[PDB]
Amino acid sequence: SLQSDQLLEATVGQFMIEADKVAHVQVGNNLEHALLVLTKTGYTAIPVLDPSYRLHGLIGTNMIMNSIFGLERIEFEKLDQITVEEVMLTDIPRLHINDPIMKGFGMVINNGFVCVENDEQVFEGIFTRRVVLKELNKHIRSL
Template identity: 35%
Template sequence: MISKPLDDVMKKYNKSYIITGEKVATVNENNDLQHVFLVLTKIKYSKIPVLDNDNHFKGFISLAMITEKMLLENNISAKYLDTITVKDVMQTNVPVINDPSNLEVIMRFLVDENFLPVVDDNNVFLGIITRKEIFNVINFTTHTFDYYYQTKENKKDD
């Protein structure tokens, strides 16, 4: 559990740490892997969110998942990528964030993930929270904590 003073200061961070869905590269679960390979290569990310036709979050797809399908016995081939869909290979057991104000849960999940999808109560994709954005919150907290709270270290002698 995050201590109350730290949590209070973190919540004073006045910028949104959610990257909205309109700004996030995504693919559809029905796209073929050849299309997704091109998208991932072009945007230079190794993993992106997968959505359905109604903008519901379905999982992640990564370059590693695609290259695994390209491996043959003695070489690599992209020959069959246009016959395999994202939903055939995507990762579906993904932690999602429903409450972006719960920094404790977000930080716990970001230990293992580079970013987390944010969804509403109907699993509609709203955006992502990245490690970088949470590091900005932590940076703000460590540099402003003494402004909001007095500690033994910064207590002035009378």
């Protein structure tokens, strides 16, 4: 455990949720698969990788619903006809594992989580608001 005066020398990677605990899907998976992963894991948005573990975007329940809401009914038969790549968000913030934690703190003001990558955009984890708030609450209650 770090002391308060060390927290800003820390890196994103030291506090991220590591990739092997992160639910994610792939660019070529269909929306039925992505919706099932979102629903079973209980998350509203998760990262999207390719088969080489490169980070490409985010997919969420709201995006999927907006793709299948029809005029008169929910067109669920389209879920397995559409790929994640066609509807995912690609305009996403990114952190590097070696970025200073203060950069991560700033980015979660406007983002519930931020994806973390190594070199070459290889996915490494996510940097969440809960981790920031848990840590900052500890250090304010001590100070």
